[PDB]
Subunit: 283 residues, 2 copies
């Protein structure tokens, strides 16, 4: 009954064997292919990657972060995570010629497009209550009232807003879907760095999904991952070549600890990842 | 090579023996599958499907209508095509409470949002010029200038404009990607009718692409189709089982005939399909 992580390993056989060179915004070249999709069963495995450690705590805590609507890279390092921190620094702000907006303020990103979609952005502390659409709710509410709705979609794409985020998202969009009280997710990431980011995202949306099956008391179905610019950077050919050699381990199970029923209620303890045995370390 | 309609023949072959039964907004059934993707070559073929005739005027008049950022549907009939008709013909408006409206008026549907993102939609009569975000053209901008960008996205799925709308868009978003000179495009499709949606919406986008590659001096690369709710109507099953018995042949070919400076300058008279064989029947 084939292991879902083969889907990813296989995508990387692909991009190695067929990718073409393509530079990013900063000139570094990569090997890129355009158009891809793997499917992960959540039938309660949790597709946290085995042939290498992904940073759980990170995923986790980053989500509670968007979940809470937040836009301060600062609000987030308070919780010991510096993956966004980097785009909140005076310097980086300034680059983009936001020389006003004070340290940490990421502009309008996931978390504000996630709950104030179309609300005018003042700053990362201007209280935004009731303002803009709260697509996180409506996804939920629709799930609970008609689950055959064939448009339960959350978008982080705002052109009106893009000329204006620390960056544009590469989760443009995710849709959900429901049948036999099983819930599935599908995600459209415009740009995918499989070496070092892809596996995080899957976590990240496998998480989201669980959270939602929970609050709506559905069962978890497939996560489907969809990419446009799937690329590996060149430094990584190496190490991935090694890693593409590892044999996947069982995916862990993810438990939830505490029947909890607003989405926004969840808290870092509420889950606990169980039996994650990632192979070690690569270079 | 190995032919491309096989893709789609696959996708279906799949659903109909693997999809679960799932009902739509007017409780009709659907064997249904969630999530696929198929890649269609645009390299000196254009991939109009064969095993099933597609309404091509239909497709070739629909985009141009989009291109021009039109939202009154009777404009599209106008030009010979009835797809989007009883959708702005009277009854289908207050079934959604649309009343202080005028008729053929679909609201801030696709055409509207390609050329005017985050712009207050009023009615269909209204010069729209200057306000919003010409997501569309910007896309042509961002290619010409600089093709590496990984962000060309023409997103229609506006949640604010979502009460206001006749139909919600099936096509929430696409990305182009150009490498080594060829252009590609991926459409993410909320939901898609394997019966009688898809053959069409592929076309539409393909042809979309030939239009940008042409305008931008680039050559068409790949159209990758992405679906969300892919489904067959229980209705279409027995017939499909039949085109399921049909072997499809080479694609046609599609030669733009004049030479076009901006996108809005297109004219239908501008497209010959070529060595085009369509079945059935």
């Amino acid at each position: 009954p084939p292991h879902g992580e083969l889907q990813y390993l296989g995508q990387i056989q692909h991009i190695l064997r067929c990718g073409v060179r393509k530079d990013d915004r900063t000139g570094t070249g990569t090997l890129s292919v355009f158009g891809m999709q793997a499917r992960y069963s959540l039938r309660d495995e949790f597709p946290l990657l085995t042939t290498k450690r992904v940073f759980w705590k990170g995923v986790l805590e980053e989500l509670l972060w968007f979940i809470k609507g937040s836009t301060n890279a600062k609000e987030l390092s308070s919780k010991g995570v510096k993956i966004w921190d980097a785009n909140g620094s005076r310097d980086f702000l300034d680059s983009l010629g936001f020389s006003t907006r004070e340290e940490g303020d990421l502009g309008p990103v996931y978390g504000f497009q996630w709950r104030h979609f179309g609300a005018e952005y003042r700053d990362m502390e201007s209280d935004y209550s009731g303002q803009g659409v709260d697509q996180l709710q409506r996804v939920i509410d629709t799930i609970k009232t008609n689950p055959d709705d064939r448009r339960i979609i959350m978008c982080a794409w705002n052109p009106r807003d893009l000329p204006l985020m620390a960056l544009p998202p590469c989760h443009a969009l995710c849709q959900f879907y429901v049948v036999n009280s099983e819930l599935s997710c599908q995600l459209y990431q415009r740009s995918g760095d499989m070496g070092l980011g892809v596996p995080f995202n899957i976590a990240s949306y496998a998480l989201l999904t669980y959270m939602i099956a929970h609050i709506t008391g559905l069962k978890p179905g497939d996560f489907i991952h969809t990419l446009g610019d799937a690329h590996i950077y060149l430094n990584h050919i190496e190490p991935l070549k090694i890693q593409l050699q590892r044999e996947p381990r069982p995916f862990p199970k993810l438990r939830i600890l505490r029947k909890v029923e607003k989405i926004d209620d969840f808290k870092a303890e509420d889950f606990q990842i169980e039996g994650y045995n990632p192979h070690p370390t690569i270079k």
